[PDB]
Amino acid sequence: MREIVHIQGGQCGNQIGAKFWEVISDEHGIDPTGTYHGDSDLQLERINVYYNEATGGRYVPRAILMDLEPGTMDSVRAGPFGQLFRPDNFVFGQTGAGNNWAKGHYTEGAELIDSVLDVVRKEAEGCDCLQGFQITHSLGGGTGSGMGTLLISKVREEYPDRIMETFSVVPSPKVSDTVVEPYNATLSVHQLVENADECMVIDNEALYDICFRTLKLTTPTYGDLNHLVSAAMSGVTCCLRFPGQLNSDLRKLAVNLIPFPRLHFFMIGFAPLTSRGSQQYRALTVPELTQQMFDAKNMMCAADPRHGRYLTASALFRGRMSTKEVDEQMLNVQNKNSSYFVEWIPNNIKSSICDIPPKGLKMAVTFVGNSTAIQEMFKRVAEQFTAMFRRKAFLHWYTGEGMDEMEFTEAESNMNDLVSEYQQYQDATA
Amino acid sequence: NKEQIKQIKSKYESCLTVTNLQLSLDSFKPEAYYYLKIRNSNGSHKTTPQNGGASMMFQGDFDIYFRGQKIVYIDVQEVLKDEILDFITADDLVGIGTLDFEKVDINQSQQRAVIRHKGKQIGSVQCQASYEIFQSNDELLEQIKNLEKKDKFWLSPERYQLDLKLKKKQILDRRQMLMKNR
Amino acid sequence: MREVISIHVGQGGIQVGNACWELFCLEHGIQPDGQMPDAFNTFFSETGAGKHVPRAVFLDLEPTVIDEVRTGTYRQLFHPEQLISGKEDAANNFARGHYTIGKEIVDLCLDRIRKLADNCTGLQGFLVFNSVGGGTGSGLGSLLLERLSVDYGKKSKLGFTIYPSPQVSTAVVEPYNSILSTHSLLEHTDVAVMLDNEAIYDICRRNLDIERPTYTNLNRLIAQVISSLTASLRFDGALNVDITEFQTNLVPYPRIHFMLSSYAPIISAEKAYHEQLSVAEITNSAFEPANMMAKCDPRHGKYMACSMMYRGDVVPKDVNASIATIKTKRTIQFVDWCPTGFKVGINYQPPTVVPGGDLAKVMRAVCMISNSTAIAEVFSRLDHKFDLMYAKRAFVHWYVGEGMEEGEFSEAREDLAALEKDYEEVGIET
Amino acid sequence: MREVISIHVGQGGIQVGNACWELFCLEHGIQPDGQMPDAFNTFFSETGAGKHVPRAVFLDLEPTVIDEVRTGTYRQLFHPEQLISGKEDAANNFARGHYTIGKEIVDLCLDRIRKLADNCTGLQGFLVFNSVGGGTGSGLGSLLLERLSVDYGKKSKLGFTIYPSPQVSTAVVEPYNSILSTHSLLEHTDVAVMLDNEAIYDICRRNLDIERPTYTNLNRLIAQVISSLTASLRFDGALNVDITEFQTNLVPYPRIHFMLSSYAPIISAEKAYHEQLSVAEITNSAFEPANMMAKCDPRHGKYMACSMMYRGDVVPKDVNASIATIKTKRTIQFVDWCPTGFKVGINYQPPTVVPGGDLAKVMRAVCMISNSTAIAEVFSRLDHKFDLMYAKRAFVHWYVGEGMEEGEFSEAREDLAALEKDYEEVGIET
């Protein structure tokens, strides 16, 4: 019951999913052949959340994979746990977008999306009670940031009451791999605010910083960043698949973390994270988890959370632990940092406990906090956008496929309005 | 005419008809003949040569067909004419005008090309322009066209002899122009 | 399901095509007979049983080079009737190969192009190679590009032209046809890469330590650059780049698409292994002005956008840590309206070595394609060379007598003046 | 229980009959002696024990060719008294072979035809071969057709006539008898196929790469076309076609039954196997104007109906997918009052190869029989050639003195004018 379907688009989203599904399968004891080989009874009670049942007793994820080029899905199939995905759900084009948002949203993405929407509708109509959808995509690419966001609007138009999740990677100015990143980032943020019920920003720069400083491993690769993102993704829905002292589905988090409908851009972090050589030194206790949870360097975004004030915060503890300690520590982390918490909403931290810890760990915490410090990312994105747009650089590529500069002006104005009205509440006082 | 128009409209995106070409140069040679060569990426037309005067008026309708770039060049050519033999002995490029028809006001029937040589202005051509979006050498060509209308076969022995006569004469006229240009 | 067709016209084009086609056959394990004793599909096609046929066509009016090809070791590889050959050479006369003898040959080439294109299903685009300072090369390249631009339309075409050196020259009349061909491909080619011989001679002398190089050594380096550019289409990589993802990242405006390339490392086996060849040092060497593949000084102009490809065991974090260092340096400055200018690609397959060649085997390499404002100097010097002889109308009779009009020389001069004005207008700050 | 009788008259007819009768004997496994060391019944008859006798008759007034036949390796095959031979040749005079010497021979031929027909039980129809530009061929063909049209009535007769080339000619008087024979067979033959020599010479030169062809090479291609046409009667196929199923599909009106043929692929063993010979490429090659078996341009006229035969391992869906592509092309346009114009036949038996011949062994082939409006050009040029000499009454005395009336020349001219007017009247849209 109350299950969700998985939809991913683009190369970055496909690579994120290729590790997210591996993590989920390892958590539920599903072999790469789709056969259950788990140890505990609880591993099968709520498997309908992510997995479907077919004849022969094997399980198949309800994931939908889409891209405008076939290479990435032809590569993910040969990887481990690549056989679980149903071949029918693979939809792709023969041309690609070339990191051009217009091509992936107006000319090419519009004709292809009917086929993927057909299978999306097939998956949603069938399921017992829908909880919602979760979306993984990147804002630095053309086909992803175009087709995914248009699909968001199409899904929202047909299921207005369901919940919608988006895990979005925004292009940081530090590690830049594409010159046209500001254009399709700014165009995508315009559409994303209007339809997504929840959005979670993730930055490659913050992932590299975490890998270099906390784990202290010499050579980070995309596999480590994907593993961290996958652990963070799994931590959110853990209590929906396992029993606990205070169950809290996604809708309950939506109620408690979004004060106003347009303020739904969160930054997350996962604890504990320790190096291989120091994993024996540390002792896992609730104070040790909560001190690392609120650490500024532990956030999955380069945004500095002590440059603003938290509107609200959430924590999803895992493992068996006493609730009194959790509540007193949450109170203590809020009394010692009163300057960084907005004062006109008292008791702005939500807590939840799940009795099933991750495989290999005795305690774990997932942190989701809505803070005013996120304005800095939109500020720098808009700064680069307005630095590049004033000369109409690279504009002809977009304008040759039916798009105009008016949609750029409206997007810039709406993004600046969002930036302004997000900080409006930072200076608000009672 | 309908089938030819249909083939033209299938191959080209638009036509420009140029009429009433008036050449004005800062200096004419009074003893020299001038003609206009009107060209685009798809072909070229030539006016009849006229004697140099303070303003020259070239009559003719010049249909210029486009498939992309809407630029016409007007080359001004000076010609030495041998009055005894009625042939062109040399052709010298005086200057080039450019008409950019994306900038031509659809409401202005009159257009002006500035003629330039080595980057300096040396005159202008004025013309009327309309836009639609979709034995002498001439006697020998007219005889060939009249045989094409009479014979169901593309290669009569008489046509082959006339085509050989035409080619020999064009080589002689080209040699006379190369001799006049020396 | 992704394909590309390479066009080779002229003596220089055929001699660099031979150079790239030993390298591709060696890299995909195909013997010179064409027989193997799913990545080949980008350049080759399967015949059903046994041999592979290249997706390439060789053009020339002068039969000597084709006859040399049809008797060498590669006689069995190419299809017998795609090596189109003429009888009479254009003899360095541009008007000949554009108006007199090229027209009767161009129809067969277009028929061959159609017959090759109907086989491909996912055609990415075309590649073309031609030495500019020759009659048949420049003329037939211009005519083929003009025919293809209307037969196919929006398909992408890439041109690896070899412009004459600043002072070193083999002919005496090459500025005329170089200027005319630049006129022709300015409005007809999507990408043009600079390849003059003098810079590559200096590269060989300084790094490879060869004091008597021949054309084969130059062509092998060009072949390596081509392989590095197209590796991302036929090998798995952490950060892929497609051909269609260029005009959205390197071409700010439709007129400006001439850029100059560089490669690193270039080193011989006698002293390669004594140093570690870290990613930082190779990416520093790639940006050195003396390692430009075209004899132009980047210190004389701004950068617009840099697209640079890695291959081997490089890790993205090391790439970011090196892009930061380059942004730090004061001798390299980017244009004002471009905050980020780097597009990064990472591939896993290390560069392959050709036996008996110059380059050694290494695990890391970098190839950069950079668009800079300094390229206007080559246009200015070619224009100055052209004006000197066009003042007295020298050598013009060799062109007027081949059907070309007198005024055709002037408009190419006007287009070059327009291009030089445009390059100055773009490079000024706001 | 299905039979067909082939008639060979004249030197060209006998020389193409020899060519087809090596091929049939080779295809059915019968040795040249006539002995095998149930499909044969279409062309042959069983004698009770041992040898097979062809259902063919050879006619000529000039004895040299028949004497050559009766001494070659095939002396034992044909029945001794069905090789009817005369004593005096007609010497390119049509009036001779229609009024003077052909009448005394035609009775024996008709007796032989009756003796062969009484043996058959399921007679499909007759085949006739005759080179038109000769006296005995055209005259005896006309007389035989006129006798058969009244002796048998509704039985179908097919004529594989070889008209003279546009400019290449062997005689000087062949337009006269060509026009007269066209007059004779216009109202007497159900199907006439164009076979002029110049087009087949060009085919051999371009594809077979033979620079010095002889008549045997032409006759082998004609024999292959005949075998492809009649394969459906003696081999199992997924989509069969009978001879009687032609006037219902290719002949819109009783007057219009002249059509021109083409064949594909035509390729030598030296370069055949390097390419895959897919059905799409062969069906594209068959429609190429340069591969017409008669020197006429199909681009100059509309199509009326296309009947095209396949043989080998071709699958119907691939045929449909290729008919769609041809309907797509803008250079091939059908007549307005014909929405669908294709009749498709598929057979399983691949074409057989003759040892020492030109063609190689392939698994797929296509033969098309297409009726088009462009055929009027050959009639117009033959008419123009006729008028030039008929203006001065040249060579007429050679015809008036052989019993023909003066006015007989004019009415053939009037019938050709009527045919040309009819072809123009049909091709105009409604």
Ligand SMILES: Nc1nc2c(ncn2[C@@H]2O[C@H](COP(=O)(O)OP(=O)(O)OP(=O)(O)O)[C@@H](O)[C@H]2O)c(=O)[nH]1
């Ligand atoms: N990099 C490189 N350049 C070459 C090579 N061969 C010729 N060139 C250049 O090509 C220019 C002249 O054009 P070519 O390619 O030699 O001759 P072409 O293009 O066939 O033109 P034609 O003279 O009419 O045959 C010279 O200035 C050379 O610089 C080569 O092997 N490598």
Ligand SMILES: Nc1nc2c(ncn2[C@@H]2O[C@H](COP(=O)(O)OP(=O)(O)OP(=O)(O)O)[C@@H](O)[C@H]2O)c(=O)[nH]1
């Ligand atoms: N395709 C082809 N045509 C031939 C061949 N032999 C002759 N012809 C053509 O036949 C025409 C003349 O007719 P022939 O067949 O040679 O002679 P005929 O039909 O027996 O008539 P007579 O001259 O009276 O004997 C010539 O114009 C040739 O083009 C041949 O072997 N193959």
Ligand SMILES: Nc1nc2c(ncn2[C@@H]2O[C@H](COP(=O)(O)OP(=O)(O)O)[C@@H](O)[C@H]2O)c(=O)[nH]1
């Ligand atoms: N975490 C992670 N990020 C990736 C991976 N591959 C690419 N990216 C990021 O995705 C961005 C490029 O997105 P792109 O591949 O063009 O998206 P697309 O246009 O939808 O295919 C780069 O800036 C990378 O930082 C990966 O395997 N893992």
Ligand SMILES: [Mg+2]
């Ligand atoms: Mg040459």
Ligand SMILES: [Mg+2]
């Ligand atoms: Mg004879």
